[PDB]
Scaffold this motif. Sequence first.
Motif, PDB file in Angstrom:
ATOM      1  N   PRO B  45       0.841  -1.303   0.135  1.00  0.00           N
ATOM      2  CA  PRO B  45       0.108  -0.120  -0.215  1.00  0.00           C
ATOM      3  C   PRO B  45       0.890   1.175  -0.142  1.00  0.00           C
ATOM      4  CG  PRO B  45      -1.067  -1.755   1.451  1.00  0.00           C
ATOM      5  CD  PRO B  45       0.550  -1.961   0.940  1.00  0.00           C
ATOM      6  N   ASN B  46       0.577   2.070  -1.202  1.00  0.00           N
ATOM      7  CA  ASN B  46       1.623   3.438  -1.215  1.00  0.00           C
ATOM      8  C   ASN B  46       0.887   4.128  -1.788  1.00  0.00           C
ATOM      9  OD1 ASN B  46       2.340   2.508  -3.825  1.00  0.00           O
ATOM     10  ND2 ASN B  46       4.562   3.463  -3.850  1.00  0.00           N
ATOM     11  N   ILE B  47       1.069   5.531  -2.157  1.00  0.00           N
ATOM     12  CA  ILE B  47      -0.209   6.209  -2.072  1.00  0.00           C
ATOM     13  C   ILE B  47       0.887   7.359  -2.927  1.00  0.00           C
ATOM     14  CG2 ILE B  47      -2.254   8.106  -3.060  1.00  0.00           C
ATOM     15  CD1 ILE B  47      -3.547   5.982  -0.987  1.00  0.00           C
ATOM     16  N   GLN B  48       0.769   7.771  -3.619  1.00  0.00           N
ATOM     17  CA  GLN B  48       1.704   9.292  -4.367  1.00  0.00           C
ATOM     18  C   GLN B  48       1.113  10.058  -3.356  1.00  0.00           C
ATOM     19  OE1 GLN B  48       5.236   8.882  -6.560  1.00  0.00           O
ATOM     20  NE2 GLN B  48       4.517   7.090  -5.661  1.00  0.00           N
ATOM     21  N   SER B  49       2.010  11.179  -3.077  1.00  0.00           N
ATOM     22  CA  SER B  49       1.752  12.651  -2.709  1.00  0.00           C
ATOM     23  C   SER B  49       0.676  13.483  -3.333  1.00  0.00           C
ATOM     24  CB  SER B  49       2.828  12.660  -1.264  1.00  0.00           C
ATOM     25  OG  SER B  49       4.464  13.034  -2.922  1.00  0.00           O
ATOM     26  N   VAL B  50       0.985  13.657  -3.931  1.00  0.00           N
ATOM     27  CA  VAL B  50       0.817  14.430  -4.986  1.00  0.00           C
ATOM     28  C   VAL B  50      -0.809  14.087  -4.692  1.00  0.00           C
ATOM     29  CG1 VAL B  50       2.654  14.674  -6.110  1.00  0.00           C
ATOM     30  CG2 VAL B  50       0.842  14.031  -7.314  1.00  0.00           C
ATOM     31  N   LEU B  51      -1.300  13.158  -4.852  1.00  0.00           N
ATOM     32  CA  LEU B  51      -2.608  12.100  -5.526  1.00  0.00           C
ATOM     33  C   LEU B  51      -3.548  13.320  -4.218  1.00  0.00           C
ATOM     34  CD1 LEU B  51      -1.677   9.554  -6.886  1.00  0.00           C
ATOM     35  CD2 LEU B  51      -1.694  11.304  -8.092  1.00  0.00           C
ATOM     36  N   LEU B  52      -2.488  12.857  -2.812  1.00  0.00           N
ATOM     37  CA  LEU B  52      -3.647  13.290  -1.420  1.00  0.00           C
ATOM     38  C   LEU B  52      -4.352  14.181  -1.437  1.00  0.00           C
ATOM     39  CD1 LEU B  52      -0.822  12.058   0.204  1.00  0.00           C
ATOM     40  CD2 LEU B  52      -3.495  10.664  -0.037  1.00  0.00           C
TER      41      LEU B  52
ATOM     42  N   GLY D  21      -2.321   2.425  -7.228  1.00  0.00           N
ATOM     43  CA  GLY D  21      -2.099   3.704  -7.377  1.00  0.00           C
ATOM     44  C   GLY D  21      -2.441   5.067  -8.048  1.00  0.00           C
ATOM     45  N   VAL D  22      -3.478   4.284  -9.352  1.00  0.00           N
ATOM     46  CA  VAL D  22      -4.218   5.780 -10.041  1.00  0.00           C
ATOM     47  C   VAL D  22      -5.204   6.432  -9.609  1.00  0.00           C
ATOM     48  CG1 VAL D  22      -4.630   6.498 -12.341  1.00  0.00           C
ATOM     49  CG2 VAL D  22      -3.203   4.671 -11.893  1.00  0.00           C
ATOM     50  N   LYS D  23      -5.137   8.339  -9.120  1.00  0.00           N
ATOM     51  CA  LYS D  23      -6.396   8.486  -8.674  1.00  0.00           C
ATOM     52  C   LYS D  23      -7.155   9.004  -9.940  1.00  0.00           C
ATOM     53  CE  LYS D  23      -7.462  12.382  -5.404  1.00  0.00           C
ATOM     54  NZ  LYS D  23      -7.116  13.440  -5.572  1.00  0.00           N
ATOM     55  N   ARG D  24      -6.792   9.384 -11.093  1.00  0.00           N
ATOM     56  CA  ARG D  24      -7.816   9.708 -12.380  1.00  0.00           C
ATOM     57  C   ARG D  24      -6.902   9.722 -13.533  1.00  0.00           C
ATOM     58  NH1 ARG D  24      -8.747  14.458 -14.605  1.00  0.00           N
ATOM     59  NH2 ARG D  24     -11.241  15.700 -14.726  1.00  0.00           N
ATOM     60  N   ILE D  25      -8.255   8.790 -13.961  1.00  0.00           N
ATOM     61  CA  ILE D  25      -8.100   7.846 -14.975  1.00  0.00           C
ATOM     62  C   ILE D  25      -8.744   8.745 -16.905  1.00  0.00           C
ATOM     63  CG2 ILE D  25      -7.677   5.845 -16.208  1.00  0.00           C
ATOM     64  CD1 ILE D  25      -8.501   4.288 -13.291  1.00  0.00           C
ATOM     65  N   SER D  26      -7.996   9.088 -17.551  1.00  0.00           N
ATOM     66  CA  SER D  26      -8.514   9.953 -19.117  1.00  0.00           C
ATOM     67  C   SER D  26      -9.309   8.476 -19.676  1.00  0.00           C
ATOM     68  CB  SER D  26      -7.342   9.550 -20.024  1.00  0.00           C
ATOM     69  OG  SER D  26      -7.234   9.732 -21.018  1.00  0.00           O
TER      70      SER D  26
ATOM     71  N   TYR F   7     -19.711  13.215  -2.755  1.00  0.00           N
ATOM     72  CA  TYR F   7     -18.252  13.520  -2.185  1.00  0.00           C
ATOM     73  C   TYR F   7     -17.488  13.902  -3.022  1.00  0.00           C
ATOM     74  CZ  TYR F   7     -18.845  10.048   2.240  1.00  0.00           C
ATOM     75  OH  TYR F   7     -18.544   9.194   3.017  1.00  0.00           O
ATOM     76  N   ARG F   8     -16.183  15.094  -3.152  1.00  0.00           N
ATOM     77  CA  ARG F   8     -15.683  15.920  -4.043  1.00  0.00           C
ATOM     78  C   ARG F   8     -14.585  14.472  -4.656  1.00  0.00           C
ATOM     79  NH1 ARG F   8     -13.972  19.739   0.146  1.00  0.00           N
ATOM     80  NH2 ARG F   8     -12.584  20.834  -1.727  1.00  0.00           N
ATOM     81  N   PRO F   9     -14.926  14.941  -6.026  1.00  0.00           N
ATOM     82  CA  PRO F   9     -14.210  14.498  -6.657  1.00  0.00           C
ATOM     83  C   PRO F   9     -12.966  14.153  -6.334  1.00  0.00           C
ATOM     84  CG  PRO F   9     -15.629  16.543  -7.599  1.00  0.00           C
ATOM     85  CD  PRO F   9     -15.910  15.838  -6.810  1.00  0.00           C
ATOM     86  N   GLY F  10     -12.405  12.534  -6.549  1.00  0.00           N
ATOM     87  CA  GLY F  10     -10.943  12.346  -5.315  1.00  0.00           C
ATOM     88  C   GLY F  10     -11.262  11.671  -4.559  1.00  0.00           C
ATOM     89  N   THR F  11     -12.126  12.356  -3.919  1.00  0.00           N
ATOM     90  CA  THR F  11     -12.252  11.004  -2.837  1.00  0.00           C
ATOM     91  C   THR F  11     -12.292  10.076  -2.953  1.00  0.00           C
ATOM     92  OG1 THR F  11     -13.302  13.070  -1.592  1.00  0.00           O
ATOM     93  CG2 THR F  11     -13.325  11.358  -0.674  1.00  0.00           C
ATOM     94  N   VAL F  12     -13.781   9.782  -3.559  1.00  0.00           N
ATOM     95  CA  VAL F  12     -13.874   8.033  -3.919  1.00  0.00           C
ATOM     96  C   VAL F  12     -12.787   7.243  -4.360  1.00  0.00           C
ATOM     97  CG1 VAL F  12     -15.923   6.163  -4.108  1.00  0.00           C
ATOM     98  CG2 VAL F  12     -16.199   9.283  -3.730  1.00  0.00           C
ATOM     99  N   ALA F  13     -11.799   8.522  -5.413  1.00  0.00           N
ATOM    100  CA  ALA F  13     -10.902   7.237  -5.823  1.00  0.00           C
ATOM    101  C   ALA F  13      -9.437   7.385  -4.839  1.00  0.00           C
ATOM    102  CB  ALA F  13     -10.886   8.438  -6.849  1.00  0.00           C
ATOM    103  N   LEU F  14      -9.692   7.976  -4.048  1.00  0.00           N
ATOM    104  CA  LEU F  14      -8.109   7.660  -3.201  1.00  0.00           C
ATOM    105  C   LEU F  14      -8.931   6.340  -2.386  1.00  0.00           C
ATOM    106  CD1 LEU F  14      -7.086  10.549  -2.014  1.00  0.00           C
ATOM    107  CD2 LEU F  14      -5.974   8.837  -3.000  1.00  0.00           C
ATOM    108  N   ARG F  15     -10.218   6.333  -1.840  1.00  0.00           N
ATOM    109  CA  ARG F  15     -10.954   5.165  -0.966  1.00  0.00           C
ATOM    110  C   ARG F  15     -10.297   3.807  -2.217  1.00  0.00           C
ATOM    111  NH1 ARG F  15     -15.084   4.651  -0.121  1.00  0.00           N
ATOM    112  NH2 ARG F  15     -16.752   6.558  -1.349  1.00  0.00           N
ATOM    113  N   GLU F  16     -11.052   3.842  -2.910  1.00  0.00           N
ATOM    114  CA  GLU F  16     -10.385   2.252  -3.985  1.00  0.00           C
ATOM    115  C   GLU F  16      -9.330   2.350  -3.347  1.00  0.00           C
ATOM    116  OE1 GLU F  16     -15.030   3.387  -6.597  1.00  0.00           O
ATOM    117  OE2 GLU F  16     -12.797   3.228  -7.573  1.00  0.00           O
ATOM    118  N   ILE F  17      -8.467   3.384  -4.103  1.00  0.00           N
ATOM    119  CA  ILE F  17      -7.293   2.982  -3.882  1.00  0.00           C
ATOM    120  C   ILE F  17      -7.155   2.096  -2.689  1.00  0.00           C
ATOM    121  CG2 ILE F  17      -4.753   3.854  -3.873  1.00  0.00           C
ATOM    122  CD1 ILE F  17      -5.541   6.325  -6.109  1.00  0.00           C
TER     123      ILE F  17
END
Lengths: 54, 54, 97, 81, 78, 101, 101
Positions: B45-52, D21-26, F7-17
């Motif tokens: 489990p690791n998430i890049q800092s900029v994505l937080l 670890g991808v947050k946004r996907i095109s 949820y603000r966009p990007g929140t559920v994405a992080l939860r899924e990550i």
Amino acid sequence: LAGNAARDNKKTRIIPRHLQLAVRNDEELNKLLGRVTIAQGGVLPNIQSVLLPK
Amino acid sequence: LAGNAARDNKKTRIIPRHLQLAVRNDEELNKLLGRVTIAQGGVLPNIQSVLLPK
Amino acid sequence: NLPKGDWHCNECKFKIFINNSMATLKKIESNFIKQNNNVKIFAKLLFNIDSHNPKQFQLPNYIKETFPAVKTGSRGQYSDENDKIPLTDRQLFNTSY
Amino acid sequence: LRDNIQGITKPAIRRLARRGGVKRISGLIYEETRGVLKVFLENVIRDAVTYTEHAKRKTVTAMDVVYALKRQGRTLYGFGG
Amino acid sequence: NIQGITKPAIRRLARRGGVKRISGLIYEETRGVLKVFLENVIRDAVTYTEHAKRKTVTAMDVVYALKRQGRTLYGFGG
Amino acid sequence: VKKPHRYRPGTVALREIRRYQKSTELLIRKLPFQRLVREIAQDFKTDLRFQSSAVMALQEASEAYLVALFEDTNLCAIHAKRVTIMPKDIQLARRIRGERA
Amino acid sequence: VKKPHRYRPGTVALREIRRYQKSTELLIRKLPFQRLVREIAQDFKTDLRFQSSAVMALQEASEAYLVALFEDTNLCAIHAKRVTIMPKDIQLARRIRGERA
DNA sequence: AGATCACGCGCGATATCAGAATCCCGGTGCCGAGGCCGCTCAATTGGTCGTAGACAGCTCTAGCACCGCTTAAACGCACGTACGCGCTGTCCCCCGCGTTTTAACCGCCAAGGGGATTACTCCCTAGTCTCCTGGCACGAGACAGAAAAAAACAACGAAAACGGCCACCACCCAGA
DNA sequence: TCTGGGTGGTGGCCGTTTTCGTTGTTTTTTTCTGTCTCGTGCCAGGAGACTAGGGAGTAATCCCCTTGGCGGTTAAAACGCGGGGGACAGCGCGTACGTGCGTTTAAGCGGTGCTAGAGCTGTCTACGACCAATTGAGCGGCCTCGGCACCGGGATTCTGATATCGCGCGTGATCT
């Protein structure tokens, strides 16, 4: 392929440069010798498009 | 290391996830098995800092 | 019996006939209006036909809406409440014996 | 069997990206990923079927896949070998 | 000694790599990367020479060391 | 007069990550992947049989490879001062890896 | 009045790229690299001798590796909408290659 | 006009009102793991013989080292321009949530292709002795190519000319 | 007759084209030198001919598991709506590389000396393959059970908005 490259260079003897040109220009040979470095081979002349002057 | 990971999860039995954690959290072991896939291992489990969020 | 050669649509014919500049188009259209004084009330309506490609007639939505039952079709097949909802390929070509 | 590459649905690629670890996907990423997966599977199954044919078998065994992956440099643990 | 890998030499290597513009700090980073690479290759080569009970590092030792790391080198009796 | 809890966009994405890095189960559905494997194999030899273990091994290898590729892709996307991965990111990752020519 | 012929910045860079992609000679001076190799080796074993061909092979491998690394670095920089290679470009190239952790 | 106090507006922080998703705690049934039993195959014990490797002596090749010149290349410095980086605004692409539909998943049944094994037999490969000729080392000779100097030409950067766009003046048409 | 709008001509500014000289590089002819290619001679590895043994081909049997199909449940995939945050295009600044000239350093080349160690040769011994006997460790299978997966209920963050309260800034009123 190396003799072809030597002819293109107007040379009658194959040198490592010609072997490198033959290997890298050819797709299949380059894939075969993918993790191989040929001494005194150099590289293929290649400049990225964005780097060329406008 | 796998048993340590299993203990951290309050689990008596070592499962592939624990082996993956043990291997990947150890620098030398992860270098030894750098090109190895452990079935059911998952990923660290690791998430890049900029994505937080900020 | 095609004219063959090269054929232009009304829009490109107007484009080459107008040169896309506004002053010449003004000198042309104002003259058209002046020469059509008898029907000046319709002047610009007459003028703008030449610059339009042919278009199939369809009722504007402000008249169809008056009748909630009616509804347009896939390519203009003008349908009513009496027309059955079309079946899908899954319901016809995939149904087993 | 026709058009099974689309069986790798958009949400499946989304899940794979999230595990990465991808947050946004095109939007265009899904087709590219399907192409990449097809290339990888073609490269692996080619060698797996080569191994199967050499053994004079009509069945591709897990050990053939393991040998193929090991050949390509992607050693896989947990299926024998 | 690592500074013997001069700035112009790294410039030439970058040019042969197709690089048009080079940042100021690229030189120290490249020196570090080259040092790491040489450390790995020379460690393997010296391991090979020690196992052969030799005090001289032969080109064959270097070739075997490179082959170990997936950097096969042709032209030195491979 | 209430508004739902979006949820603000990007929140559920992080939860899924977090959820999918915590777990290990395969993310691709099994039957579609099996059908894809058989279809691809049909171009190398006809009337082939597959051990269920063989298909599972292929799925594990493919999923691991795709996850690693997406990690590299995310790294390139962040390198370009972006947060969204784009096909150019995958192409650069593959080109640097040495897979794509 | 007088004016030097200074080439616009970036032109001699292209000329040098063409010149050095067309040649094959080693771009690092022999003697400094030989001294560097000896110093690195002396860490692992003392009173070591090197065959001239051994140092030449080391130089060829090192230069080829650095050239490939700079190719990947240039690709990474271009990916970032830049033209200059910067240390983060090398770091990303190495990380994607799998060299640096 | 300046300072102080009160009120209003804006921004930050905490709380909160909630509600959403996750983690945790408990009971429960399970099937996967650990263990005991029996059988047998592979490892251990004992012995032989032969060649692979250890060791000493000698040779001489190659590595090291040193010196001294010359000169290509590194180092240094400066001007500036163009590229990196920050800020900003816009547009839409992508995330989020929700019905709605699809088909994956499970489980259960039926069939048989083909994996796996066993037994028989022979044809292929190892092994060995004798024969020899292909491949290697050494020597040589000469021409392919490096070098080089000079000319030709083929990419880089300034003022004039031509063309296009904008502004101003003059002429013509339309309106007042 | 005067004013406004539109067209035509002239002038000015900007962009593009060309137009030119300058370096840098490519091409061409002459020189010359050292490595590629050919020949000679010896030897040792390949060939030939032959024997022995067993690895593998081939047939037969069987029992797994791979395929196919079918139905029910429902989890997931799809499609849509909506909004906002991220991509990206643009602009401006500033500074940090690039290009070029001068100075300095040390790489490079040629030459000679020394000896360290790599290679080769001869000899010898002891270590390992090979073989036979046998017995015990490891493996297949079965049974028991308990670690953990499932499901339900509960606690806990926690994420996002609004609002309340506090602090800061601005405006208005009062005092000096």
